[PDB]
Design a protein around this ligand. Structure first.
Ligand code: K
Ligand code: K
Ligand code: K
Ligand code: K
Ligand code: K
Lengths: 82, 82, 82, 82
């Protein structure tokens, strides 16, 4: 896959995760964007996490759709800076 | 391995992790399924974690059997959506 | 590397991590073994973590020496069960 | 990439993460170095995490720039010890 296409795919994941956490769990836009990155990178501090059943389901969907996309994106970014 | 076989293997892991956390640590089915995904993806928020020796042993078995299976499953899912 | 050699290497890592956490941070043998797996798998719940400077230094050494070894071990285990 | 170049790149990441957490979030140099490793390895205990918007933005930049670099560094270290 072209690197720019991978960029678009990870940006779509980031939008999905951020809007979902914001509307389902009620955290600010900024906190939700931070949480999205922390989640799809698999860092998972746990300072923020879903407290509702819908949020838990949503978080599973983000894990399944986002961790692989983020991993490929990081690997492509490696090529362009190294 | 055929992608559908990998799907069955990760589903077996998810059933194992969910039933085990539910019966050993006493969390709800929904929380246990969420915790299973959070664990085998290596996100590990820590909002849920085993509190008993048996739960800690069980969690190690899920880590050993589940992280690799989940990683292959995510990589295969990448092929079918990208 | 032969799979059995990888097994010995990850077992050495597990012994190192477990004894170190036990003696430096003072947690039980069982908790320390659980924490070692949670750490080198990069799950990182945070229910246990080093509280002392020596423990933090030790944990960095385990992260550097252990995450790669564990990742290769999981990948080899995948070959023998799938 | 030559392994020694990868070493320099991960050291640059470690300096960036450590100084940034120290000055933005106000934690000690030692805690900030520990947190940097815990973050770029994706362990993410959560015993330390950014509490400010600037810290959250900075942490995202470290995640994006650091996880891939650390992963390659660990893989190279594997070659030299195994
Ligand atoms: K992780
Ligand atoms: K983690
Ligand atoms: K974590
Ligand atoms: K990999
Ligand atoms: K955590």
């Amino acid at each position: 896959v072209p690197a720019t296409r991978i960029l678009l795919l990870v940006l779509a994941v980031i939008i999905y995760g951020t809007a979902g956490f914001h509307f389902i769990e009620g955290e600010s836009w900024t906190v939700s964007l931070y949480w999205t990155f922390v989640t799809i990178a698999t860092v998972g501090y746990g300072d923020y996490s879903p407290s509702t059943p819908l949020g838990m389901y949503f978080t599973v969907t983000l894990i399944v759709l986002g961790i692989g996309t983020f991993a490929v994106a990081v690997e492509r970014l490696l090529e362009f800076l190294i």
